[PDB]
């Protein structure tokens, strides 16, 4: 019983992650159900993702998103296959907001946990 | 204008060879340090994949898959200091493999990496 | 309707947090269900808490824990009252492992999310 | 030994006055910066409460509650260098007040603070 990163995923915020694994890379499309300020994520709150995925029964993943307005996000996670059979992607993320210069950037990094379930 | 393409070095002694073609970043990462011995394999090198914005002080996000299945990610921004230096200010996460969901709580480390240009 | 920080909470790993407010401070007991390396959290996987709670309806909290073998942890968070009447304590945490020196400390900090519910 | 008790300053210019009592730390933090005008109060100072371990290079964990409801926590270690210099090495989180659960998703920031002595 394997956890397969390829698929369509939904997080606890209601964001959708559509992902295709090929070789050791991932591509696809992230639609965020929220943004940090109006505009940030763009026209349909959507952007391309690019990243890596490991081999194995419970693979690790890492992937990046650049948001239309110049902020950017990164996730690292592992695909686990639960005892009830649900496929689950446990991730932490960083969101990096554009700063004006180095001195004002101390506060430009946010973090959190996204849990993605297959739909 | 700060530019991401080039060869960089961090406070740990690690090296980052980066090349942008537009919004994409590719390259190679050599880490001077490892969480377990050989976790990054014998050359401690891996490929890098990510994104870089446009603008003069662009933001950057990139991932590395390590040889034995851990993976790191960096976000940051390319700054021109007063003195002419180009600096990549980043924060990273290192995700170690875990056996099951229940052991995964302790799987994510973080830190800050300052990359300077060789 | 408010969120009340005082009491016994339980998070996703089964760890129990007992909070007593004394003014702006919080004191109490943390019993972790899990530890890094056997005995890191001491004989009873238990230690005391110290920190702060704000004055809202939905207060923010900050608290810290020194474990027996010297690693330390801190959580920051807010106490939300939900539509269904439930009180959820939403935190993020940092675990600091002891290192021998500055250079080998690069990997000494881990992070996660803890969602506490009231018992 | 590295001694936590004292007056400390970090890369941002913020000042940290702490004293140690058993395994408890107390004192005042004066931040050189804030998220919004006045988040740290008119004087940008607040009390600190936390913990410090025994040993030659002790670990530390402290909190601060800010005037307008946000809060910050630091975890770290007091490393003593070759040159005899004492150095507090930390990572922090800053939680901002949110109106409700759903809109709290982006309410946590982090960073590194490195403190030197006066
Ligand atoms: O606010 C921004 O700068 C762009 C949108 C940010 C979306 C973030 S990425 C991490 C978190 N998880 C989500 O699904 N959305 C938010
Ligand atoms: O430990 C592993 O699982 C593989 C090596 C990780 C190297 C990390 S990546 C974050 C940090 N920055 C560096 O330059 N090296 C370490
Ligand atoms: O591993 C150690 O060094 C001591 C025990 C740490 C337990 C951590 S603290 C954050 C997380 N949440 C819990 O409930 N327990 C773990
Ligand atoms: O913005 C706020 O809500 C309150 C002030 C935050 C000050 C932060 S705490 C982490 C960082 N280190 C400092 O010395 N100052 C900032």
Author numbering:
A (entry chain E), C (entry chain G): 4 to 122
B (entry chain H), D (entry chain F): 5 to 122
What did the published study say regarding this structure?
In the current study, we present the characterisation of an avidin-like protein in zebrafish, called zebavidin. Although zebavidin has many unique physicochemical and structural features, it clearly can be classified as a new member of the avidin protein family based on its structure and function. Structural and functional characterisation confirmed the hypothesis that zebavidin is a new member of the avidin protein family and binds tightly to biotin, even though the biotin-binding affinity of zebavidin is substantially lower than that measured for avidin or streptavidin. Zebavidin is an avidin-like protein from zebrafish and highly expressed in the gonads of adult fish but our preliminary results suggest that it is not critical for the development of the embryo.
